[PDB]
Scaffold this motif. Structure first.
Motif, PDB file in Angstrom:
ATOM      1  N   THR A 141       4.316   7.489  -5.961  1.00 47.73           N
ATOM      2  CA  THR A 141       3.931   7.635  -7.352  1.00 47.73           C
ATOM      3  C   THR A 141       5.178   7.966  -8.157  1.00 47.73           C
ATOM      4  O   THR A 141       6.301   7.897  -7.651  1.00 47.73           O
ATOM      5  N   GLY A 142       4.979   8.328  -9.423  1.00 48.20           N
ATOM      6  CA  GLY A 142       6.083   8.630 -10.325  1.00 48.20           C
ATOM      7  C   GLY A 142       5.723   9.647 -11.376  1.00 48.20           C
ATOM      8  O   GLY A 142       5.013  10.624 -11.100  1.00 48.20           O
ATOM      9  N   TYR A 157      -4.196   6.509  -9.068  1.00 48.47           N
ATOM     10  CA  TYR A 157      -5.316   5.928  -8.355  1.00 48.47           C
ATOM     11  C   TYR A 157      -6.306   5.309  -9.332  1.00 48.47           C
ATOM     12  O   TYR A 157      -6.400   5.701 -10.496  1.00 48.47           O
ATOM     13  N   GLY A 158      -7.038   4.317  -8.843  1.00 43.12           N
ATOM     14  CA  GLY A 158      -8.013   3.631  -9.650  1.00 43.12           C
ATOM     15  C   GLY A 158      -7.433   2.650 -10.636  1.00 43.12           C
ATOM     16  O   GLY A 158      -8.183   2.105 -11.455  1.00 43.12           O
ATOM     17  N   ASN A 159      -6.133   2.394 -10.582  1.00 46.81           N
ATOM     18  CA  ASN A 159      -5.490   1.534 -11.560  1.00 46.81           C
ATOM     19  C   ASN A 159      -5.423   0.099 -11.054  1.00 46.81           C
ATOM     20  O   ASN A 159      -5.485  -0.170  -9.853  1.00 46.81           O
ATOM     21  N   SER A 170      22.119  -8.884   4.317  1.00 46.29           N
ATOM     22  CA  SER A 170      21.285  -8.734   5.500  1.00 46.29           C
ATOM     23  C   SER A 170      19.883  -8.331   5.072  1.00 46.29           C
ATOM     24  O   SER A 170      19.703  -7.462   4.214  1.00 46.29           O
ATOM     25  N   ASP A 171      18.891  -8.975   5.690  1.00 50.11           N
ATOM     26  CA  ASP A 171      17.495  -8.846   5.277  1.00 50.11           C
ATOM     27  C   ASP A 171      16.963  -7.502   5.769  1.00 50.11           C
ATOM     28  O   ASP A 171      16.326  -7.387   6.818  1.00 50.11           O
ATOM     29  N   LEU A 172      17.246  -6.461   4.982  1.00 55.22           N
ATOM     30  CA  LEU A 172      16.739  -5.121   5.245  1.00 55.22           C
ATOM     31  C   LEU A 172      15.303  -5.012   4.759  1.00 55.22           C
ATOM     32  O   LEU A 172      14.662  -6.031   4.484  1.00 55.22           O
ATOM     33  N   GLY A 173      14.793  -3.784   4.663  1.00 57.95           N
ATOM     34  CA  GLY A 173      13.453  -3.593   4.135  1.00 57.95           C
ATOM     35  C   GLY A 173      13.205  -4.365   2.854  1.00 57.95           C
ATOM     36  O   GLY A 173      12.141  -4.962   2.673  1.00 57.95           O
ATOM     37  N   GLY A 174      14.182  -4.373   1.951  1.00 60.46           N
ATOM     38  CA  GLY A 174      14.158  -5.296   0.845  1.00 60.46           C
ATOM     39  C   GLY A 174      13.359  -4.840  -0.360  1.00 60.46           C
ATOM     40  O   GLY A 174      12.367  -4.113  -0.261  1.00 60.46           O
ATOM     41  N   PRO A 175      13.795  -5.272  -1.520  1.00 56.89           N
ATOM     42  CA  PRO A 175      13.107  -4.909  -2.760  1.00 56.89           C
ATOM     43  C   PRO A 175      11.839  -5.714  -2.986  1.00 56.89           C
ATOM     44  O   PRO A 175      11.916  -6.943  -3.037  1.00 56.89           O
ATOM     45  N   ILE A 176      10.680  -5.062  -3.097  1.00 60.85           N
ATOM     46  CA  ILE A 176       9.482  -5.687  -3.659  1.00 60.85           C
ATOM     47  C   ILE A 176       8.784  -4.659  -4.535  1.00 60.85           C
ATOM     48  O   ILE A 176       8.591  -3.521  -4.108  1.00 60.85           O
ATOM     49  N   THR A 177       8.391  -5.051  -5.744  1.00 63.24           N
ATOM     50  CA  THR A 177       7.706  -4.124  -6.636  1.00 63.24           C
ATOM     51  C   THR A 177       6.262  -4.534  -6.875  1.00 63.24           C
ATOM     52  O   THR A 177       5.857  -5.672  -6.631  1.00 63.24           O
ATOM     53  N   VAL A 178       5.490  -3.564  -7.354  1.00 65.21           N
ATOM     54  CA  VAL A 178       4.140  -3.773  -7.846  1.00 65.21           C
ATOM     55  C   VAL A 178       4.030  -3.059  -9.194  1.00 65.21           C
ATOM     56  O   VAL A 178       4.771  -2.113  -9.493  1.00 65.21           O
ATOM     57  N   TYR A 179       3.117  -3.552 -10.032  1.00 69.18           N
ATOM     58  CA  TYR A 179       3.013  -3.166 -11.440  1.00 69.18           C
ATOM     59  C   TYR A 179       1.673  -2.486 -11.706  1.00 69.18           C
ATOM     60  O   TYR A 179       0.613  -3.101 -11.557  1.00 69.18           O
ATOM     61  N   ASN A 180       1.725  -1.220 -12.109  1.00 69.37           N
ATOM     62  CA  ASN A 180       0.562  -0.595 -12.726  1.00 69.37           C
ATOM     63  C   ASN A 180       0.455  -1.070 -14.165  1.00 69.37           C
ATOM     64  O   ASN A 180       1.440  -1.040 -14.911  1.00 69.37           O
ATOM     65  N   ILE A 208       0.836  -1.193   0.000  1.00 70.51           N
ATOM     66  CA  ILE A 208       0.000   0.000   0.000  1.00 70.51           C
ATOM     67  C   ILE A 208       0.874   1.246   0.000  1.00 70.51           C
ATOM     68  O   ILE A 208       0.467   2.305  -0.487  1.00 70.51           O
ATOM     69  N   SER A 209       2.094   1.143   0.535  1.00 70.21           N
ATOM     70  CA  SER A 209       3.043   2.241   0.375  1.00 70.21           C
ATOM     71  C   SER A 209       3.507   2.338  -1.070  1.00 70.21           C
ATOM     72  O   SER A 209       3.750   3.438  -1.580  1.00 70.21           O
ATOM     73  N   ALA A 210       3.625   1.195  -1.747  1.00 76.06           N
ATOM     74  CA  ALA A 210       3.827   1.215  -3.191  1.00 76.06           C
ATOM     75  C   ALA A 210       2.690   1.962  -3.873  1.00 76.06           C
ATOM     76  O   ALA A 210       2.907   2.728  -4.819  1.00 76.06           O
ATOM     77  N   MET A 211       1.467   1.746  -3.399  1.00 72.81           N
ATOM     78  CA  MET A 211       0.330   2.490  -3.925  1.00 72.81           C
ATOM     79  C   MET A 211       0.477   3.979  -3.648  1.00 72.81           C
ATOM     80  O   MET A 211       0.166   4.813  -4.505  1.00 72.81           O
TER      81      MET A 211
END
Lengths: 49, 49
Positions: B14-15, B22-24, B39-49, B8-11
């Motif tokens: 923006t860019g 929104y609404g996508n 070391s397991d930091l916050g770590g990369p995870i992406t989401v796709y519009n 939801i922070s990915a939501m």
């Protein structure tokens, strides 16, 4: 209810804090500081006055 | 879970489109787990519009 934009160094500038002022009331037409808030650089800020 | 605090922070972030997005429709992950790395930091995870 007011929603205030996410903080922008370009549009807002030096400071992420903001002062909401009141105007046409009583006998004073000029500004009177009515509220202060801190702007969110990750999302837009919601408040009810 | 990982779901809220990540996706939801990915939501929220923006860019180039100019705020919004929104609404996508998004193709997200059901569940996400550590795989490897120094070391397991916050770590990369992406989401796709």
């Amino acid at each position: 209810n007011f929603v205030l934009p996410k903080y922008d160094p370009a549009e807002h500038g030096d400071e992420r804090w903001f002062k909401i002022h009141i105007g046409n009331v009583g006998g004073n037409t000029g500004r009177q500081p009515y509220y202060s808030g801190m702007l969110s650089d990750t999302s837009e800020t919601s408040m009810t006055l | 879970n990982v779901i809220r605090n990540k996706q939801i922070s990915a939501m929220k972030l923006t860019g180039v489109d100019g705020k919004s997005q929104y609404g996508n429709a998004f193709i997200i992950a059901n569940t996400v787990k550590h795989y490897g790395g120094y070391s397991d930091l916050g770590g990369p995870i992406t989401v796709y519009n």
